[PDB]
Design a protein around this ligand. Sequence first.
Ligand SMILES: CC#CCNc1ccc(S(=O)(=O)CC2(C(=O)NO)CCN(C(=O)OC(C)(C)C)CC2)cc1
Ligand SMILES: [Ca+2]
Ligand SMILES: [Ca+2]
Ligand SMILES: [Ca+2]
Ligand SMILES: [Zn+2]
Ligand SMILES: [Zn+2]
Length: 162
Amino acid sequence: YNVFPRTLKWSKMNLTYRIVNYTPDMTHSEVEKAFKKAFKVWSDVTPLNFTRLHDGIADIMISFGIKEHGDFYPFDGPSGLLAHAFPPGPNYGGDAHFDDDETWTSSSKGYNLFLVAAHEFGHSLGLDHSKDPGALMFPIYTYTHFMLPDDDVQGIQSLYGP
Ligand SMILES: CC#CCNc1ccc(S(=O)(=O)CC2(C(=O)NO)CCN(C(=O)OC(C)(C)C)CC2)cc1
Ligand SMILES: [Ca+2]
Ligand SMILES: [Ca+2]
Ligand SMILES: [Ca+2]
Ligand SMILES: [Zn+2]
Ligand SMILES: [Zn+2]
């Protein structure tokens, strides 16, 4: 696994996240479950915890956008870039953005929100890309009870512990 050199981790165990807006292709419930399940992945192997706030500021501000959307790191329309998150830190730190130009699902068609989101929150927590083609933090999307690969388990625990 790989981590950035920075800013490594959050000084607090219980973090907050917020879902600013939603995608057309999934119901509010579907999306909420994906994100909830995406965090559950990292929380199960770490002392971390995530609380969802309805409004105001949250450590991890989640949102769906297309093209230029407020950070000068524009999306490229369908396919190509799927989503990006920023490593731990104040403000934009932690936040995750999903290209609303892609087709988000709970299945295999288009791109599976949960899987991508699971990856993206990895970033939100301090993990960079893993060179292990079996790691959730590998730079290539690949569709797959979800068990978090070993490398990834090694990753966050080296930051936050078991
Ligand atoms: C199992 C599983 C899974 C999900 N994996 C996954 C793979 C690729 C992407 S991506 O298409 O968003 C590629 C990207 C990524 O991995 N985002 O997390 C986007 C952000 N990014 C970026 O802006 O890079 C430059 C500008 C330095 C080229 C690095 C690559 C997203 C999720
Ligand atoms: Ca709905
Ligand atoms: Ca933030
Ligand atoms: Ca794209
Ligand atoms: Zn963005
Ligand atoms: Zn990535």
